[PDB]
Every structure is written in C-alpha cells, then in structure tokens.
Amino acid sequence: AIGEFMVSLPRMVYPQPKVLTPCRKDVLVVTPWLAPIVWEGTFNIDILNEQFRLQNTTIGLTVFAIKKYVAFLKLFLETAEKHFMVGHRVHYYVFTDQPAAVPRVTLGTGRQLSVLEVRAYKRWQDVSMRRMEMISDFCERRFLSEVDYLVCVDVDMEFRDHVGVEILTPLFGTLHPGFYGSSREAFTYERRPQSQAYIPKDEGDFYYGGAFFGGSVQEVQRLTRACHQAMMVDQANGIEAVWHDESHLNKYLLRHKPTKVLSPEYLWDQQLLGWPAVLRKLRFTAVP
C-alpha cells in the first residue's frame, strides 16, 4: 500500500548526516521545485528500505518485448532479479506479441511475472509510441488494483547495480544520459509549434529519457493517458514528434514537475558514453 501517514522507524545506527559537509559537491542534488535528484551518495538505503517495507510496498515494472526484442528478456529479467527492488514485492508486466517466447526465469520470493499479449505495430516509432496507450489501458485493467508504484522501462537493457526504493515517489523522470550536461537549447525537444509536444527554446528544466519513468499508479496513468492523447492529436494534424513518445514525456514533465528526478546512473549507455567520474555507479545500462 501507499501509507496515508509517515511511518514509525525502529532504532537504527548509521553515520550522522553532516550539514556542513555534503558528500556530493559536483552535481545538483535537488531541483528548483525541491525534488531530490537521485545520485549515489545522496541516500541511505537502509532508512529508505525500512520506510517502504513498513508500508508493504509493491512495485510493478512494465517492459515491452515486441517482435525481435523478446531476445532481450532473459538478461533483463535475470539482472532485475539481482538488482531491482530486492526485498520488496515486485510484479513484472511483460507486454509481448509472442507469449510463448518469454523465457523461463526463476524468481525470488514475493516476486511475480505476468505476460500481457499485445499488438505488434509495423513501424518501430509506433511500437515505441504505443507503449503510452498500452500502459494507460493496463493501469485501469490491472495496475490500480495490483501494485502501488509503476516503473516503466526499455527492454534492451540490463541491471548492473542497485535500483531500489530510493526512486519511488508520486512521479519521476530520469535524466537522459546524452543530455545531462547540456544547455536547454541543445535538448532535442520537439520544436515545431504545430506539435502538442512543442517546447520553445527558452523553456525546459531537463531532457528526460523515454526509457525510464514511473510514479504511483495514478500518476503514471495520468501521464501515459496524457501522452497518448497528445500523440493522437498530432496524428490527426499530420505530424509526428521528433523523438516520439520521449518528446511527449518531456512536454508532460515540463508542465507537471516530477517529485524525484533520477540521475543518469539509472539510464546509461557505456558503449556510447563510457564511465565518467560523475557516475559513481552504473545501475541500468544499454545492451549492444
């Protein structure tokens, strides 16, 4: 459940936080709307685990494995078992056009997987974009009654390190690894005013990656519904956003500020970007 009130922790022994000696001095760790930006060194996972376990938190994880991308499922799921929300209840939701191709993966206690059969669109743009419609639809059918939070990610990825309850919050986006150091004018937002995803050059906080977002079920339902609706308006007007669902996600999170932002530790591509000093951990990374 998502508790109505603050929970009561047991006695715990850990290092005193140091008001005058912040660990991360190299990166911004809070947004201008006072949302934490989650980097290694900003959180004590023992405190956060207690808080979330005391609420018997269930996390749903959606992933789309359409056409040849079913190949990615085995590593994705096996690494999620090692690194994603270990100790908490997890419900995996695998959307696929090939239920029989979902690999048999052994799950730890309190963890379950459901296979959702869906349509395979012809164009990769449509496969990517239609995820918003499909997640939104399933928030109603399944997720609202089954999980507390939803985490929505790309499948061509593996977990290499801890991804845990530090990410959970009503609404979150993740800094795209290609743009975390970039100026807003360089962000590849949709720039045509004819598109619902339009963001002009003097607006923008961050460029969020389409491959990792989430929040409470109700906030994810609202976001995915809104993005789908915007995409449908664009389609009726004969326009397709430059970065598809990611463009609409960015317009959405611009106007609806996320309550946490994840650092690129949570969405990385080591082949393209290496391992910069600013990344103390690489947690969720692209597979070739």
Ligand X SMILES: CC(=O)N[C@H]1[C@@H](OP(=O)(O)OP(=O)(O)OC[C@H]2O[C@@H](n3cc(-c4ccc(C=O)s4)c(=O)[nH]c3=O)[C@H](O)[C@@H]2O)O[C@H](CO)[C@H](O)[C@@H]1O
Ligand Y SMILES: O=Cc1ccc(-c2cn([C@@H]3O[C@H](COP(=O)(O)OP(=O)(O)O)[C@@H](O)[C@H]3O)c(=O)[nH]c2=O)s1
Asked whether position 1 contacts its own copies by CB under 8 A, the answer is no
The residue whose Cβ lies closest to Mn ion is 154
Centroid of chain to Cα 25: 25
Asked whether position 75 contacts its own copies by CB under 8 A, the answer is no
Using CB under 8 A, pick the residue from 89, 142, 225, 257 that binds its own copies: 257
Q: For residue 66, say whether it is annotated as part of any ligand binding site.
A: yes
Q: For residue 248, say whether it is annotated as part of any ligand binding site.
A: no
Measured from the CB atom, the residue of 91 and 176 that comes closer to ligand X is: 176
Asked whether position 177 contacts its own copies by CB under 8 A, the answer is no
**Cβ count within 10 A of residue 72:** 17
Sign of CA dihedral 281, 94, 130, 196: negative
Asked whether position 93 contacts ligand Y by CB under 6 A, the answer is no
Measured from the CB atom, the residue of 57 and 247 that comes closer to ligand X is: 247
- How many residues bind to ligand Y according to rule CB under 6 A? 14
Measured from the CB atom, the residue of 40 and 158 that comes closer to ligand Y is: 158
What would the x/- binding string for ligand Y be over residues 158 to 197, using CB under 6 A? ----------------------------------------
Q: Say which entry of ligand X, ligand Y, Mn ion, none residue 91 contacts (CB below 5 to 8 A, set by partner kind).
A: none
Sign of CA dihedral 152, 222, 4, 112: negative
246 is annotated as an active-site residue: yes
Measured from the CB atom, the residue of 52 and 95 that comes closer to ligand Y is: 95
Q: Which residues are the active-site residues? A: 246
Binding residues: 64-66, 69, 154-156, 176, 188, 246, 269
**Contacting residues toward its own copies, per CB under 8 A:** 4-14, 16-22, 25-38, 42-44, 47-48, 51, 166, 170-171, 175, 180-181, 183-184, 200, 202-206, 218-219, 222, 255-260, 278
